[PDB]
């Protein structure tokens, strides 16, 4: 037990009074991300597909800027903390005995893996944010759909031509346009990559030490997008949103079927 | 102070003890009659050994099972008795460390934090996720956990001291399921040991006498042909029991859940699935560093069979090692008590003043 | 009756003891008490009925 205790004390970045501050700052920022949320919905309005597309894409631009500012701030905080961790350890920042230089190399390796850990955390924060807001949208749709404070979420028009009746936007326009919106969300969330691939970490993780090169593990390790593709439940929620769309259009189809009785006399009098 | 909601066997110790001073069974009793029958009923509460001794006048449940605190009042009763009887102290003198299952819903996580803070006087406190500190007892920061025999059966991949929340899943079998299958095969054999006394005797049997076949088809054909591999046991009534294929059929249910009728891939393949969920870079470390835990792992042969089965699943490039702490049915408690020993950990706690503004948010955050 | 402090904690002082109970006292459902409660229920409930009878004759004068 004392042997593994010692191995832990060696390991515990989580307890070391320097990597611990850096973690605490990054963790706080992750908290601020998780609370910031994502998508927005209006409880007392009824979007056209064009309206919903525009409002959501604008919301994507807003949060994209937020996430970029956030990431670049974190990037600075990480680099500056790493430079502290070297300078306090007797290591000189690379931008600035041989076994002691190897101890520098080892220290940079652990700093690398600590950064990568922070990236894994942030990535999971984004994953949870995305799926939870998708669940919220599903709950909005289904709770309004039950009325097929309770204003319906979307607006539609019914077109009577002499030949046939159709709704604008159609089920095709809802399915493809909301798929477009969903995929804008997906790629915007996917857009900003983890920190690991940034030049700051490339340099310090590959530190030029005793005037000799060193190397490191890299961004194509940490892969949020893999688990975004793995989350069967988020994909299912999107499919069920499409089922709510389909059922609502089935109700519209029924109403248009009633309107086809009026279309009978319309076609009769227009042929007369 | 160290506190464990161990759902097969709950446990407590001062921090940095060598063993949990107190070990106690995962039960609290209520009087089974609604009136106080006699002055023994000074309380409506009979935690732990109290229930075990007094079952017949008492109402009997495992208050938790699987992934959650279920029944907050009865757990608070258990913890209160843990502090006042089992730890034999008013705790607030020293920090307290507590256990939770992995992927415990954050609602429960804060609810528990609140309950502990408001109900029990305390300087500073933390609840820890059984896999993470169980891995600390391994000494790795980077490892996958298995646990069975103290809870539902988890897989948990851990990188540099933290999980991949992406990759947490249960196999919905617990210690009872082993007793259930063993009761089935005993009743087939004809012992029909199922009464609550028989149930306890069978739990003793399964704890000491289980073994895991190295290649079940071969070992089963060997024992069924060669009954020299089936071994004798003395019952409390002086009967002799013979136990044979049952010794490894029971653990085999972990490998073939359909043996207990469960439609699931075995522990090996569900572990392999969990690994595959994570980064291949982590995956190689997980194959290098597997940790198995809980009373079901305590058996002989389990870690060898698991090593072979993971090697069969693992790519031929992967190095395979099951890491099998002789204590592994306590792994979490060992890691927690060791970590809590460290005065540098003292800064990690959360305490009253920050607990007010920060505490709801800051504990939820530090709990990760 | 219930609220009598368990003797141990006052009687012994030279160590911490806590989680102290009360004494035990006779509860609310020991049968002899329950049947006394029944008897007094009968006594009042039935005695109230002759007041009904007297009110009944007064109800014509009402």
From Swiss-Prot, chain B:
Keyword tags: Acetylation, ATP-binding, Cytoplasm, Cytoskeleton, Hydrolase, Methylation, Muscle protein, Nucleotide-binding, Oxidation
The residues forming the signal peptide are: none
Please give the family membership noted in the entry: Belongs to the actin family.
Report further notes: In vertebrates 3 main groups of actin isoforms, alpha, beta and gamma have been identified. The alpha actins are found in muscle tissues and are a major constituent of the contractile apparatus. The beta and gamma actins coexist in most cell types as components of the cytoskeleton and as mediators of internal cell motility.
Quote the tissue specificity entry.
Expressed in the liver (at protein level).
Q: Which InterPro entries match?
A: Actin, Actin/actin-like_CS, Actin_CS, ATPase_NBD
* Name of the protein described by the UniProt record: Actin, aortic smooth muscle
Q: GO biological process: what's one of them?
A: regulation of blood pressure
Keyword Cytoplasm among UniProt keywords: yes
Q: Which residues carry this modification: N6-methyllysine?
A: 77
Which catalysed reactions does the entry list for this protein? ATP + H2O = ADP + phosphate + H(+)
Entry's EC annotation: 3.6.4.-
Swiss-Prot record, chain C:
- Indicate where this protein resides in the cell: Cytoplasm, Cytoskeleton, Cilium axoneme; Cell projection, Cilium, Flagellum
Phenotype upon loss of function: Mice are viable and show no malformations; however, homozygous males are infertile, due to inability of spermatozoa to move from the uterus into the oviduct. Spermatozoa show decreased motility. In addition, tracheal beating frequency is reduced.
Of which family is this protein a member?
Belongs to the dynein heavy chain family.
Subunit info here reads: Consists of at least two heavy chains and a number of intermediate and light chains.
Q: What does this protein do?
A: Force generating protein of cilia required for sperm flagellum motility. Produces force towards the minus ends of microtubules. Dynein has ATPase activity; the force-producing power stroke is thought to occur on release of ADP. Required in spermatozoa for the formation of the inner dynein arms and biogenesis of the axoneme.
What protein name applies here?
A: Dynein axonemal heavy chain 1
Per the UniProt record, the source organism is: Mus musculus (Mouse)
Organism lineage string:
Eukaryota, Metazoa, Chordata, Craniata, Vertebrata
Tell me what gene encodes this.
Dnah1
| Entire-sequence positions represented here | 679 to 740 of 4250
